[PDB]
């Protein structure tokens, strides 16, 4: 369905989408090739959706983060680039866009937030959050606010949750594990406390959004906003003198804002893909491409190592730079759907007053794991680790209605190749309740009861935070 001979790409309307048409005009101009820059409305739910059924964009532009969940779905491309030009760019973007040993996207820019003051208002930005109810009821007497940063979207409130012991998934071993989640650790907890406390104490309103946000600062009613590097060219087009500094610590802590590398994935039912990587690697991610698309809304840290020594010497880029390095990297495992539409409701239920921040974060850890990926969960860690290999083979035997090219690929299968297999097929619940019927005909009555206990436990939690 995707038409062949063109170019279809999609990015984020809050980047620089007009200077990345100009590189897609310069590439027709270059091989009479049309390259149409679209900025679709919640096009990282989109894609997952339009891609799924062989449709969608060539080129798919996101934080790294979601392409994780994408590759999973087996939505994207493998890349592969030459290591020529895999020099060309630092190599902690391309750990960025690795997934299972795979590349599975270019790496363009990385992104931090970073804390961004009115000059005019505040000659000398707060260094810590402690600091900003008694700087708000100063400007509050000049008729102005002192922060004012979008609440609707987690990814803002993140780094002060961060910043005294919240985290997203633990990485231990080399591996993110996503039985060890740390949006309600005593740290998140008193993260999101003082920002409820700023609401309740009328420094700030629950209901500020990105677009409130941006307008309150760029009109010189508010002292300090956060945002991020694509947020400097409105603020430049503005009367308002800024500067971009370190985000406030909170408790002696650094503010650690998750970092994001801006990313290109090529959509795998794509027939341009050649194209695409050519694009890509040899008119993007060039000094002049980047520059086209940075002067339009700039990019942060680009990942291209002959520009970025250019953009360094900008002491907004140092100010990214910093605060990245305070800052965590984004997980990139499917997980990361789940963990961000959590934490986004504990945030918008906890500042509303829906909810305490106890309850509101206690219902967060339950929801930032899907109950397919802890239901996979039960039936290989629960399941399938508790046979040997020969028992593997008699349950293996069970699985030959489900055809599946039985004959020599089921007989390879490992376990978490099976429970892959049988979710696949069937859906999560109805993959566990099979191996629980399995595991009974194979007389394993202890250990199929053992998996109905914990298939109760999850489902259980799950009930406890719904109503
Ligand atoms: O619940 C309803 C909302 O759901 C939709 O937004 C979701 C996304 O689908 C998730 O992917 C996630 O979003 C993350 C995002 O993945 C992450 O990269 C980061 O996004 C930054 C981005 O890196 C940066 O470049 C810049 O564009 O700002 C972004 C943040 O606004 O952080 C996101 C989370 O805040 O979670 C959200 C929901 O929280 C849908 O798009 C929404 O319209 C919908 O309301
Ligand atoms: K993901
Ligand atoms: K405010
Ligand atoms: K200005
Ligand atoms: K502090």
Redesign the pocket.
Same mark, same amino acid.
């Given at each position: 369905k995707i038409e062949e001979g063109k170019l279809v790409i999609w990015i984020?309307g809050?980047?620089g989408y007009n200077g990345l048409a100009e590189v897609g005009k310069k590439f027709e101009k270059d091989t009479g090739i049309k390259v149409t820059v679209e900025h679709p409305?919640?096009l /990282? /739910?989109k894609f997952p959706q339009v891609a799924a059924t062989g449709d969608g964009p060539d080129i798919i532009f996101?934080?790294?983060?979601?392409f994780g969940g994408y590759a999973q779905s087996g939505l994207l491309a493998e890349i592969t680039p030459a290591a020529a030009f895999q020099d060309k760019l630092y190599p902690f973007t391309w750990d960025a866009v690795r997934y299972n040993g795979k590349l599975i996207a270019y790496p363009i820019a990385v992104?931090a937030l970073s804390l961004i003051y009115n000059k005019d208002l505040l000659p000398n930005p707060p260094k810590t959050w402690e600091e900003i109810p008694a700087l708000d009821k100063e400007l509050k007497a000049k008729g102005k606010s002192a922060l004012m940063f979008?609440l609707?979207?987690?990814? &803002?409130t993140?780094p002060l949750i961060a910043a005294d012991g919240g985290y997203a998934f633990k990485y231990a071993a080399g591996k993110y594990d996503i039985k060890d989640v740390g949006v309600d650790n005593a740290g998140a907890k008193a993260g999101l406390t003082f920002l409820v406390d700023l609401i309740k104490n009328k420094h700030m309103n629950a209901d500020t959004d990105?677009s409130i946000a941006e307008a309150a600062f760029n009109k010189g009613e508010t002292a300090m906003t956060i945002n991020?590097p694509?947020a400097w060219s409105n603020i430049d087009t503005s009367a308002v003198n800024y500067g971009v500094t370190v985000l406030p610590t909170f408790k002696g802590q650094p503010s650690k804002p &998750?970092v994001?590398v801006?990313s290109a994935g090529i959509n795998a039912a794509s027939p341009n893909k050649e194209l695409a990587k050519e694009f890509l690697e040899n008119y993007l991610l060039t000094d002049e491409g980047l520059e086209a698309v940075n002067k339009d809304k700039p990019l942060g840290a680009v990942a291209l190592k002959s520009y970025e020594e250019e953009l360094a010497k900008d002491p907004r880029i140092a100010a990214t730079m910093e605060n990245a390095q305070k800052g965590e990297i984004?997980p990139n495992i499917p997980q990361?759907?789940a963990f961000?539409?959590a934490?986004?409701?504990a945030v918008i239920n906890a500042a509303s007053g829906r909810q305490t921040v106890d309850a509101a974060l206690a219902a967060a850890q339950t929801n930032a794991v899907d109950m397919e990926s802890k239901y996979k969960e039960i039936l290989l860690l629960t399941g399938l680790d508790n046979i040997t290999d020969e028992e593997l083979d008699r349950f293996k035997f069970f699985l030959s209605d489900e055809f599946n090219i039985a004959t020599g690929k089921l007989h390879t299968a490992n376990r978490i190749q099976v429970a892959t297999l049988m979710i696949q097929n069937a859906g999560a619940v109805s993959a566990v309740m099979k191996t629980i019927r399995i595991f009974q005909k194979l007389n394993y009555m202890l250990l199929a009861k053992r998996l109905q206990e914990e298939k109760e436990k999850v489902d259980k939690q799950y009930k406890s935070v719904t109503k």
């Open positions: 984020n809050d980047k409305d919640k /990282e /739910e996101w934080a790294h983060d979601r992104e979008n609707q979207e987690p990814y &803002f993140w990105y991020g694509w &998750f994001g801006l984004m990361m759907s961000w539409y934490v986004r409701t």
